[PDB]
Design an enzyme around this catalytic site. Structure first.
Site, mmCIF file in Angstrom:
data_model
loop_
_atom_site.group_PDB
_atom_site.id
_atom_site.type_symbol
_atom_site.label_atom_id
_atom_site.label_comp_id
_atom_site.label_asym_id
_atom_site.label_seq_id
_atom_site.Cartn_x
_atom_site.Cartn_y
_atom_site.Cartn_z
ATOM 1 N N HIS A 177 -7.655 9.137 -2.541
ATOM 2 C CA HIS A 177 -7.083 9.086 -1.197
ATOM 3 C C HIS A 177 -8.042 9.647 -0.155
ATOM 4 O O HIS A 177 -8.102 9.150 0.976
ATOM 5 C CB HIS A 177 -5.758 9.847 -1.166
ATOM 6 C CG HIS A 177 -4.836 9.421 -0.065
ATOM 7 N ND1 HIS A 177 -3.467 9.364 -0.224
ATOM 8 C CD2 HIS A 177 -5.083 9.041 1.211
ATOM 9 C CE1 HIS A 177 -2.912 8.963 0.905
ATOM 10 N NE2 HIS A 177 -3.870 8.760 1.792
ATOM 11 N N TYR A 190 2.885 9.820 0.098
ATOM 12 C CA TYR A 190 3.859 9.231 1.010
ATOM 13 C C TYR A 190 5.302 9.559 0.651
ATOM 14 O O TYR A 190 6.193 9.283 1.462
ATOM 15 C CB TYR A 190 3.689 7.709 1.055
ATOM 16 C CG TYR A 190 2.329 7.229 1.525
ATOM 17 C CD1 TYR A 190 1.409 8.108 2.083
ATOM 18 C CD2 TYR A 190 1.972 5.891 1.414
ATOM 19 C CE1 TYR A 190 0.171 7.670 2.509
ATOM 20 C CE2 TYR A 190 0.736 5.444 1.839
ATOM 21 C CZ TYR A 190 -0.161 6.337 2.386
ATOM 22 O OH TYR A 190 -1.393 5.897 2.811
ATOM 23 N N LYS A 196 -2.499 5.989 -4.701
ATOM 24 C CA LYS A 196 -3.643 6.816 -4.343
ATOM 25 C C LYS A 196 -3.533 8.182 -5.002
ATOM 26 O O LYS A 196 -2.461 8.794 -5.013
ATOM 27 C CB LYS A 196 -3.763 6.977 -2.819
ATOM 28 C CG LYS A 196 -3.722 5.662 -2.050
ATOM 29 C CD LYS A 196 -4.258 5.806 -0.638
ATOM 30 C CE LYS A 196 -4.022 4.536 0.164
ATOM 31 N NZ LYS A 196 -2.573 4.307 0.424
ATOM 32 N N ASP A 250 0.842 -1.194 0.000
ATOM 33 C CA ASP A 250 0.000 0.000 0.000
ATOM 34 C C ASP A 250 0.879 1.246 0.000
ATOM 35 O O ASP A 250 1.591 1.511 0.974
ATOM 36 C CB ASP A 250 -0.936 -0.007 1.206
ATOM 37 C CG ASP A 250 -1.935 1.130 1.174
ATOM 38 O OD1 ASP A 250 -2.947 1.012 0.453
ATOM 39 O OD2 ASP A 250 -1.706 2.143 1.868
HETATM 40 N N1 LIG Z 1 -5.861 5.947 3.095
HETATM 41 C C1 LIG Z 1 -5.391 6.734 4.225
HETATM 42 O O1 LIG Z 1 -5.817 7.838 4.415
HETATM 43 C C2 LIG Z 1 -4.353 6.150 5.175
HETATM 44 C C3 LIG Z 1 -4.131 6.743 6.375
HETATM 45 C C4 LIG Z 1 -3.204 6.224 7.222
HETATM 46 C C5 LIG Z 1 -2.493 5.081 6.848
HETATM 47 N N2 LIG Z 1 -2.703 4.491 5.650
HETATM 48 C C6 LIG Z 1 -1.958 3.300 5.240
HETATM 49 O O2 LIG Z 1 -2.089 2.117 6.349
HETATM 50 C C7 LIG Z 1 -0.876 1.735 6.643
HETATM 51 C C8 LIG Z 1 -0.808 1.332 8.138
HETATM 52 O O3 LIG Z 1 -1.478 2.356 8.944
HETATM 53 P P1 LIG Z 1 -0.549 3.215 10.013
HETATM 54 O O4 LIG Z 1 0.378 4.117 9.280
HETATM 55 O O5 LIG Z 1 -1.421 4.031 10.908
HETATM 56 O O6 LIG Z 1 0.351 2.156 10.864
HETATM 57 P P2 LIG Z 1 -0.208 0.816 11.715
HETATM 58 O O7 LIG Z 1 -0.496 -0.353 10.768
HETATM 59 O O8 LIG Z 1 -1.462 1.156 12.515
HETATM 60 O O9 LIG Z 1 1.003 0.390 12.777
HETATM 61 C C9 LIG Z 1 1.220 1.295 13.876
HETATM 62 C C10 LIG Z 1 2.568 0.959 14.551
HETATM 63 O O10 LIG Z 1 2.518 -0.278 15.029
HETATM 64 C C11 LIG Z 1 4.038 -0.853 14.954
HETATM 65 N N3 LIG Z 1 3.984 -2.257 14.657
HETATM 66 C C12 LIG Z 1 3.908 -2.939 13.502
HETATM 67 N N4 LIG Z 1 3.880 -4.259 13.791
HETATM 68 C C13 LIG Z 1 3.944 -4.393 15.139
HETATM 69 C C14 LIG Z 1 3.953 -5.503 15.950
HETATM 70 N N5 LIG Z 1 3.892 -6.906 15.543
HETATM 71 N N6 LIG Z 1 4.022 -5.361 17.282
HETATM 72 C C15 LIG Z 1 4.084 -4.122 17.829
HETATM 73 N N7 LIG Z 1 4.077 -3.023 17.032
HETATM 74 C C16 LIG Z 1 4.006 -3.164 15.679
HETATM 75 C C17 LIG Z 1 4.650 -0.211 13.991
HETATM 76 O O11 LIG Z 1 5.910 0.432 14.512
HETATM 77 P P3 LIG Z 1 7.351 -0.074 13.869
HETATM 78 O O12 LIG Z 1 7.528 0.530 12.523
HETATM 79 O O13 LIG Z 1 8.480 0.356 14.776
HETATM 80 O O14 LIG Z 1 7.334 -1.582 13.750
HETATM 81 C C18 LIG Z 1 3.673 0.921 13.496
HETATM 82 O O15 LIG Z 1 4.305 2.104 13.450
HETATM 83 C C19 LIG Z 1 -0.017 2.991 6.378
HETATM 84 O O16 LIG Z 1 1.300 2.690 6.186
HETATM 85 C C20 LIG Z 1 -0.674 3.540 5.096
HETATM 86 O O17 LIG Z 1 -0.139 2.758 3.931
HETATM 87 C C21 LIG Z 1 -3.634 5.017 4.809
HETATM 88 C C1 LIG Z 2 -2.649 17.600 2.976
HETATM 89 O O1 LIG Z 2 -2.786 16.986 4.248
HETATM 90 C C2 LIG Z 2 -3.947 16.355 4.575
HETATM 91 C C3 LIG Z 2 -5.185 16.781 4.126
HETATM 92 C C4 LIG Z 2 -6.306 16.094 4.526
HETATM 93 C C5 LIG Z 2 -6.204 15.025 5.401
HETATM 94 C C6 LIG Z 2 -4.966 14.626 5.865
HETATM 95 N N1 LIG Z 2 -4.878 13.535 6.757
HETATM 96 C C7 LIG Z 2 -3.837 13.214 7.546
HETATM 97 O O2 LIG Z 2 -2.914 13.990 7.727
HETATM 98 C C8 LIG Z 2 -3.840 11.850 8.184
HETATM 99 C C9 LIG Z 2 -2.757 11.538 9.002
HETATM 100 C C10 LIG Z 2 -2.651 10.328 9.626
HETATM 101 C C11 LIG Z 2 -3.619 9.385 9.459
HETATM 102 C C12 LIG Z 2 -4.723 9.661 8.697
HETATM 103 C C13 LIG Z 2 -4.840 10.883 8.044
HETATM 104 O O3 LIG Z 2 -5.864 11.254 7.219
HETATM 105 C C14 LIG Z 2 -6.853 10.258 6.903
HETATM 106 C C15 LIG Z 2 -7.937 10.953 6.193
HETATM 107 C C16 LIG Z 2 -9.288 11.152 6.455
HETATM 108 C C17 LIG Z 2 -10.105 10.675 7.600
HETATM 109 N N2 LIG Z 2 -9.840 11.822 5.493
HETATM 110 O O4 LIG Z 2 -8.827 12.087 4.567
HETATM 111 C C18 LIG Z 2 -7.686 11.554 5.023
HETATM 112 C C19 LIG Z 2 -6.460 11.710 4.220
HETATM 113 C C20 LIG Z 2 -3.834 15.315 5.478
#
Ligand SMILES: NC(=O)c1ccc[n+]([C@@H]2O[C@H](COP(=O)([O-])OP(=O)(O)OC[C@H]3O[C@@H](n4cnc5c(N)ncnc54)[C@H](OP(=O)(O)O)[C@@H]3O)[C@@H](O)[C@H]2O)c1
Ligand SMILES: COc1cccc(NC(=O)c2ccccc2OCc2c(C)noc2C)c1
Length: 314
Positions: A112, A50, A79, A45
């Protein structure tokens, strides 16, 4: 271990989250994405936001060159960022992502966020008062441009991210809809389990993809430090001992058994390899109800600044 999408393509149910804060050097994203593939991750992902698509693409390319994997074995997601919602900007944005990652196609391209922002190359356009500048865009026209990206073969599947029920219905009820969203990637964890939105998506055969499944990175920029630490939850920790697993493995297995595709970010080799063990054990129906009870309506991303946005999903 995959789920069939409503367009006929398949998506692995466990995905590797690639986002790291800008303080993390870009070379780490290259290293850990290789490690993820080494450990058995096949769903990767990423996003234009990013600032890592080149490094993620290099890692995929490297694992294809050493014969670990074929392009057909990797499910790569990018995204469209909110500054490119205007339809004429959608295809060049995807083409830019493809060029940076050096791929011919993405397996999945997502809107996104529904919160459109001022068009431009600036990811966070801010006015003289430091306030993010919103844009107004008919997201149905953005989706139409996404459908053309699928027809052109640049994206195998298309979906959305951070959409609520009303915004999803806007797409599903669009006159002349060609492709439904295959998925809606949203924040989803035992403290925010989205059961309502999950039931809606299932009724429309849309996959819910959970991010922050492990409780987020708790970045200081968006996460109140006083908010509860998900992985320290006693029910999660007690369930870990019962099954001889970790609280993170409980959180990931929770999503798999309720029909959710789950993402897991780690830049630590040993935690990357641990996370793929989610397929080794199983929670009872009683364990699942215990986790269901943890819902706090707590989304680790907040901002009162985006609350004013007309399309703020919460
Ligand atoms: N569409 C969106 O708006 C959106 C928003 C946020 C995130 N995302 C995507 O979702 C992915 C994951 O979400 P997230 O960024 O919030 O991170 P997450 O999956 O919730 O993980 C949070 C923390 O948990 C730690 N971790 C991982 N495995 C572990 C384990 N077995 N035991 C203990 N800790 C562990 C990691 O630290 P360490 O690195 O030190 O292991 C990580 O920083 C992101 O990378 C991104 O691609 C998308
Ligand atoms: C330009 O910066 C922008 C502008 C808008 C929104 C954001 N959002 C974030 O910084 C963010 C940070 C960490 C986790 C999740 C996050 O956003 C999830 C989310 C939701 C809910 N709706 O849209 C999004 C994206 C950042």
């Amino acid at each position: 271990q995959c789920v069939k999408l409503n367009d006929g393509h398949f998506m692995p149910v466990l995905g590797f989250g690639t986002y790291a804060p800008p303080e993390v050097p870009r070379s780490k994203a290259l290293e850990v994405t290789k490690l993820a593939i080494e450990a058995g991750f096949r769903h990767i992902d990423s996003a234009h936001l990013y600032n890592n698509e080149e490094q993620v693409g290099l890692a995929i390319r490297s694992k294809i060159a050493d014969g670990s994997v074929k392009r057909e074995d990797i499910f790569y997601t990018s995204k469209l960022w909110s500054t490119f919602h205007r339809p004429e900007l959608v295809r060049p944005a995807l083409e830019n992502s493809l060029k940076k990652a050096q791929l011919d196609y993405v397996d999945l391209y997502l809107i996104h966020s529904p919160m459109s922002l001022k068009p431009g190359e600036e990811l966070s356009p801010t006015d003289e008062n430091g306030k993010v500048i919103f844009d107004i865009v008919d997201l149905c026209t953005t989706w139409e441009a996404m459908e053309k990206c699928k027809d052109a073969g640049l994206a195998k599947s298309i979906g959305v991210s951070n959409f609520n029920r009303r915004q999803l219905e806007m797409i599903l009820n669009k006159p002349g809809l060609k492709y439904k969203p295959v998925c809606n990637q949203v924040e989803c964890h035992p403290y925010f389990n989205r059961s309502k939105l999950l039931d809606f998506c299932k009724s429309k055969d849309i996959v819910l993809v959970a991010y922050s499944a492990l409780g987020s990175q708790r970045d200081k920029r968006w996460v109140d430090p006083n908010s509860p630490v998900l992985l320290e939850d006693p029910v999660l920790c007690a369930l870990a001992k019962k099954h001889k697993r970790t609280p993170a493995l409980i959180a990931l297995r929770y999503q798999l058994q309720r029909g959710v595709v789950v993402l897991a970010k780690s830049y630590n080799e040993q935690r990357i390899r641990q996370n793929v063990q989610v397929f080794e054990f199983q929670l009872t129906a009683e364990d699942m109800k215990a986790i269901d009870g943890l819902d706090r309506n707590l989304h680790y991303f907040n901002s009162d600044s985006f609350a004013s946005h007309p399309n703020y999903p919460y």
